[PDB]
Design an enzyme around this catalytic site. Structure first.
Site, PDB file in Angstrom:
ATOM      1  N   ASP C 105       0.868  -1.171   0.000  1.00  0.00           N
ATOM      2  CA  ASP C 105       0.000   0.000   0.000  1.00  0.00           C
ATOM      3  C   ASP C 105       0.909   1.227   0.000  1.00  0.00           C
ATOM      4  O   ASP C 105       1.866   1.260  -0.761  1.00  0.00           O
ATOM      5  CB  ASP C 105      -0.953  -0.031   1.205  1.00  0.00           C
ATOM      6  CG  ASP C 105      -2.043   1.010   1.118  1.00  0.00           C
ATOM      7  OD1 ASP C 105      -3.014   0.790   0.373  1.00  0.00           O
ATOM      8  OD2 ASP C 105      -1.932   2.046   1.806  1.00  0.00           O
ATOM      9  N   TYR C 213      -3.323  11.421   1.221  1.00  0.00           N
ATOM     10  CA  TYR C 213      -3.956  11.556  -0.091  1.00  0.00           C
ATOM     11  C   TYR C 213      -3.817  12.968  -0.630  1.00  0.00           C
ATOM     12  O   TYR C 213      -3.579  13.161  -1.826  1.00  0.00           O
ATOM     13  CB  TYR C 213      -5.433  11.131  -0.018  1.00  0.00           C
ATOM     14  CG  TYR C 213      -5.516   9.654   0.267  1.00  0.00           C
ATOM     15  CD1 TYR C 213      -5.468   8.729  -0.767  1.00  0.00           C
ATOM     16  CD2 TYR C 213      -5.553   9.184   1.568  1.00  0.00           C
ATOM     17  CE1 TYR C 213      -5.496   7.381  -0.512  1.00  0.00           C
ATOM     18  CE2 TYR C 213      -5.580   7.835   1.832  1.00  0.00           C
ATOM     19  CZ  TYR C 213      -5.557   6.939   0.792  1.00  0.00           C
ATOM     20  OH  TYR C 213      -5.571   5.598   1.062  1.00  0.00           O
ATOM     21  N   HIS C 272      -6.065  -7.198  -1.077  1.00  0.00           N
ATOM     22  CA  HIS C 272      -5.139  -6.116  -0.769  1.00  0.00           C
ATOM     23  C   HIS C 272      -4.414  -6.246   0.586  1.00  0.00           C
ATOM     24  O   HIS C 272      -3.378  -5.614   0.792  1.00  0.00           O
ATOM     25  CB  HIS C 272      -5.911  -4.790  -0.818  1.00  0.00           C
ATOM     26  CG  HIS C 272      -5.051  -3.571  -0.744  1.00  0.00           C
ATOM     27  ND1 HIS C 272      -4.315  -3.111  -1.816  1.00  0.00           N
ATOM     28  CD2 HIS C 272      -4.823  -2.702   0.269  1.00  0.00           C
ATOM     29  CE1 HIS C 272      -3.670  -2.015  -1.465  1.00  0.00           C
ATOM     30  NE2 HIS C 272      -3.958  -1.746  -0.203  1.00  0.00           N
TER      31      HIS C 272
END
Lengths: 291, 291, 291, 291, 291, 291
Positions: C105, C213, C272
């Site tokens: 990630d 982000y 994931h």
């Protein structure tokens, strides 16, 4: 047939190579420049007839025939730019101010370079199956690699080892190119092929020739200069053998970007070796073009 | 070294060819598929060790080794699709329902085809330096023609004439590929190279091998089917020799479009002949992958 | 289940952040780096088993868990380059010369950066579902915006206000990502999800995470350096969960441009969160890869 | 402020939905069509003034307000083509031959479709911030995903669960769009926002609205027909709020391919909700345009 | 009809040209700028009505009408940048701080330039069939050369010789453009056309006009500056005559890149000469736009 | 100078047109085909000399000279395909099986078409400044519209009205093309130009000529057939006048795609009218080429 020994042989010491040549005739100087896999003698059918009107000079390129093979490990000494310089030096050494110059194959590039770099040393020029700076992407492109594979074979040490391993191996290899690149095979009689093989088998001559491919036709080579990418308005007589598969007549389309004063004639029954396959055409068109 | 004569040799009559193979061991069937310029014997270092866990079957491809050379003028009989069909027929003929299948080089394509066309005949597969339907544009592209030139040399009659002209010429030619395609040259001892040359010099074997290039790798060839352009979710163990210059490890990027259930491992000190250069890696990774 | 309080908790003052971590075991140092929306505890199933062979160190990234949240208005303090610097500082602070490093990630990028910027501090590395400098155009491209929309939601103040408005809202939001990004939902038991929610609801943790982000995945962000765009020949063990929809296994094709010494394995029943969904695979593959 | 209860409310049974509307005034019929996240009441500031010159009809779109929510699992019942059909049916049901039609947002597409599919039922039209068949690639493209992310959020079940989890969560979510899409925030007073939230919190209304995104704005959706890709020469009055970030005034460049008889005016202090933010402009421009 | 002699005529000496103009009315200054093949008098139908609200100023462009023709051999004196400078000088010379400015055709470019170069001298502007820096590739492109051929005809000396060879030749030539560029031919009465021809036949006027094409519309011309390629947020009223074939209404799509504060209206029964064909529209829209 | 009246004039009734021609000499038939803006008489300098070796036939194309002008409203009767058909009919009508054919300008296309459609009626051909199916995009492209503008002028009714308005206007117009398209202006003496003008001023001749542009060179025209897009291996002698600006010598690059058996010679001091500007070159090269 006019064998090698039936010409008069000369050597001249230029600045970094000894150049071998034959010379014959009287008149304006006509310089005839050979390609691979031949040498000066590929012109042997036309030298005599042309000598009736010209001082015909026919050298071996450096790395070919009886001319010196420079340091075989130094690819800079096999760059086509230096081969063009050799022609200027040859003319200087012989006290010649201007010449008519004729080339094909590798010498198509030599003449391309020469007439732009030494424009005051040329009367008129002729090129057979001409090669321009835009050749590269076509020649090593797809599908032309079916024809150009040999330029990459020559990059390997094994190619020299194999082709020189015996006179028989040598003959087998070179015969393919004489025949496949011609309009109608066989190109040569047995005796004529033996003479080409004799020359290829001279010490370092196969290696010397392959060095042209290593210096000028590797996938990282760039033999062209900025000056080469200019338009020439010198009178140039061009012929194409439509049977030439390795430098095909489609490549006429690359010529107009580089020349503004030329003629072009497609010869229907000739391939890559115009002076060998159609010698009377060569004699006629040069006598006419250079009148 | 385990020489050819120290294996047990078989022949079986399939629908349009006789296939030669060696066979050894007990367990699930493991089918090992060779490439060019080798034959079944390139697997000779791993057959013994693998036979401790598997029924190891190692055939000569049609056109190779002691397997039949189909009509040398009929290139359709040298298409890789038929070579994949031969493997299904071999299994049928031996009464084998399912096998583990391993390939590289030409057999990378054979395995690609096989696992999609005969999915019920495979337990798991392995491919070394895998080749996918997107290989073509890279392989015959620029600058890879510096490596792939030989595929086009093989299109010529002269290549067969030259390479088979003597045992010496043959040795010179093939040695280049064993050495240049390996991570550390020499790949082979003198005795090992002699054995490969013995095989190449068998009647029609050089021609047979070159026919693979004519049928599947000419500039107008297309060896791939629609079925080949499908994703396989069969478990596939993949290895790459990072020293492989002709099928380089960059080509991993072409694999994800065709496989959803694989492993990949880049072997740092191996080139194109993993089973020859790193036999212990091959034995270990196949035993592990096919546990 | 091994709850957070059943580990030993540490904090260390680095140059501009306090980093929280847990640590366990003996041997070479193994540094495990988490992603979003988790924290150090996502590794809780594998820490114990791995500590039998390694000195396992598991930090919260800056802005996550119990690590310091830098100035929430200063996005430069949430750049991934600084997060990679934090790992070098952590090793320095603990007197550790070299470590095995593992990420996925966001930490896939951290490890990408780390092994190139601090190559002398790595023994070997592992990355799960790796992310390269060519990720951006795919991830924010069409149609992947169907999966990446949340990266843009996080740019808004309203996202923080909404997600932290209640523990119930928080649970609803984060559960979607745990479940949708996994191969088989539910990923978590109720108690396990409560622990992740407890962490997200700590002051500034949702905001801190969303700042990643804003700093690294806004439409004008560029988290990659020139150094990141280099090939690494460090040994890297890579795994992919084929059930991962947000960083899908198709992205293997981006890996060969950046790595020359790696393995890749597609895990068929994982998404994931490999360390959560298939902890025994993680333990086995790291023990094997880092032997 | 004119609250919902201070209008006269109607319902009519159309072929597959019940449509709710308010109606007021006398003159030619003026049909006002709302968007997301509003409903009929967003027109409440202009209905009264416009009713002095027109028979103003203001429906809730199917899936919105007090109009029927068709089968929530059937996305075909939320296609914009059917919403345009509903307007033709509404006019039929009310015995109206022709109307002036006005739309924006989703109703920009409804009007686009309507005037081409039912050209004989339109006197003149008006569109605010018009949307054409070429919208898609821009809207879901880069960098506009920074603005369009919500269309993909709405594809998830979690979006409905989260936004309807409480009146507080609902208010938080929708307030962002009213404010961010306007020229000057806040768009609404507290009482006005409460009324919009009251409507969103009605059973199935959030889900109903999100179904518009699922049916018409998924990454595999195509709401446009061949007929939509035609030029209309109906008189169309167009306004743009230059403060609209989600359907920005740059998109004027897409209009000329679809219209040959229009006006365009960029309003400097308005965003996406022209009838809310600049009601006097709307009243003036429609009265003028439709004189 | 209001003939030229029924206006009051002025001349003013600017820095490098004498400019002729008519002037009428009281109020804010309104500057009306003509195109080719007209002159100031093309505005004659609207000057009177507009003078009721404005100080209307209507000059001949340099090289047109009764304004000076600069050195006919010096194309730099016919660049549109200097024509825009002339308007600033005109305002200075008349003691006018700010004006409303209106242009079309060549003056569409003049106004484009003027409002960006002299932004403090403009109140509001209007352009009919506006032309932006992106005009060039369309206008001299295919198939628009069917309409733009005349711009290249004008590059030739023969065009001047032919068109001025007699009043009859002159009339024939110019009538085509008045009629073909209008929505409904004939544009002009016989008396009106005679007046335009009278003007064209004045010494050097045809040549002067053609010099605009030579300076600004040759295939090596570039009349645009960096400043021209900026967005203007000045209020601009734009009209398009949909019957204009040479600057067609499709070119609205080029406007949004250069303007952020404009209106656009497509007039259905007008072509290229809005002030001639629809004078009442011009009067109404300017009075409204500039209120 | 050899005036029109000093030749023998013929007319023959073909299937849908009457064709006028002159004829002279004895030997193989040589058909000479004119272009625009000339007629048969442009060949007048070479007809006599060539008639010493050939039966020289020189027609007016339909729509030119004294040949019939078909229905001026029917552009299908001015398509170049029919003009090529006329030449086959002419040969049939005169009882001629095969001819040498020569063309330039429009007749370059006629000859292109003729030798492919009627290959058995040609001995050899010659083309001056040849035009191929790939001409279109260059000729109406940018920047060549600076030269090709006239092809679009001719689409207008006004062009006919203007050019025929007087003998003086006619002379002015056509003189430009004779001079600008030649290497050294003036091309013509005053008496020679008067003769061309006499011909242009014959009833319907300007209109007839302009119809060639309307039928074959409008922006929606396509005069080429599938058959035209084939390679011809007929012997073709090609000349280029390097001074030709409208069909420039760069267009040699378009020739190799259509011809495999040709010669090309760039004439240094000639433009578009080789037979007028360098008549001795034309006589010599045709006598030589057609020996």
């Amino acid at each position: 047939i006019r064998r090698p020994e039936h010409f008069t042989h000369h050597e001249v010491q230029l600045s970094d190579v000894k150049i071998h040549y034959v010379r014959e005739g009287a008149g304006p100087t006509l310089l005839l420049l050979h390609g691979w896999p031949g040498f000066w003698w590929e012109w042997s059918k036309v030298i005599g007839p042309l000598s009736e009107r010209f001082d015909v000079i026919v050298p071996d390129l450096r790395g070919f025939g009886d001319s010196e093979k420079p340091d075989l490990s130094d690819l800079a000494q096999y760059s086509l730019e230096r081969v063009a310089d050799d022609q200027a030096e040859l003319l200087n050494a012989l006290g010649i101010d201007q010449a008519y110059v004729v080339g094909h194959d590798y010498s198509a590039i030599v003449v391309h370079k020469f007439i732009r770099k030494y424009p005051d040393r040329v009367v008129k020029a002729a090129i057979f199956d001409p090669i321009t700076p835009d050749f590269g992407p076509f020649y090593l492109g797809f599908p032309h690699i079916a024809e150009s594979w040999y330029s990459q074979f020559h990059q390997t040490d094994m190619s020299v080892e194999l082709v020189t391993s015996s006179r028989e191996a040598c003959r087998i290899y070179f015969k393919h190119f004489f025949d496949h690149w011609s309009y109608h095979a066989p190109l040569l009689t047995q005796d004529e092929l033996d003479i080409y093989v004799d020359n290829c088998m001279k010490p370092n001559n196969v290696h010397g020739g392959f060095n042209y491919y290593r210096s000028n036709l590797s996938v990282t080579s760039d033999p062209w200069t900025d000056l080469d990418r200019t338009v020439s308005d010198l009178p140039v007589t061009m012929l194409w053998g439509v049977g030439d598969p390795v430098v095909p007549s489609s490549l006429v389309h690359q010529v107009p970007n580089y020349y503004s004063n030329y003629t072009m004639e497609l010869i229907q029954d000739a391939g890559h070796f115009m002076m060998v396959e159609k010698p009377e055409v060569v004699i006629d068109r040069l006598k006419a073009g250079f009148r």
